[PDB]
Ligand binder design. Sequence first.
Ligand code: CA
Ligand code: CA
Length: 254
Amino acid sequence: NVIWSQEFDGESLDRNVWSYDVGGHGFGNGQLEFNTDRPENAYLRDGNLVIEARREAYGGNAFTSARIHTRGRFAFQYGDLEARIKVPDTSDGIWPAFWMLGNNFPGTVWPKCGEADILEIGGKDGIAKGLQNRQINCALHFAGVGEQKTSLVEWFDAPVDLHLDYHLYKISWTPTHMKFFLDGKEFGSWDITASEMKEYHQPFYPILNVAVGSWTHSYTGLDTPEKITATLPARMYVDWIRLYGHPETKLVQN
Ligand SMILES: [Ca+2]
Ligand SMILES: [Ca+2]
């Protein structure tokens, strides 16, 4: 029961749904890319959203990409949100993500707003073990007991090379759980009923981005332009994002 979707069929990204996060300040992870609002980094073509990371001097950084979200235009609480994505070869450097934030961000500060990562790929462990094209994770980031940052992470070694084709990346979100799926199969699950997880019973909005690098202590382990070996340009193809409604779903389209 699709009740909301972006099919990415047009010639340009719909600014009446999408907003750009612009900057090269590192986004609290020591990221190297400058996320721009230009057509070179986010464009539509052949029924796809393309987010393109490039090795390119821009704004004082050595890479450009894009980070887009629907805050203010689309949010929901409970439902199945799924995206058909072909990720780029991450081959040491590239850090794509499909994730969500609570709809009270940024007024409510992170992570009290709550966060759910549906797909992340390109981690340091994946690099260390030669599983760059296979190892993924989902995650919950929130204010736990005593209102302090808590992180729950579930890793999964995918069976096939994910950058070779489109796959379906989904969250199933109910009043009791958040579950995460690859091609219909569950690889993560958490109960969200506990007193410290009330942040996960409000509307959330989706985010899509392709980051380049991080601090060494952060996701990729690769903190300088010279340590980025990945094939650039790197393109993430999104065929669509669809919300399958539940009885309890609330839609926010203001
Ligand atoms: Ca499409
Ligand atoms: Ca909490």
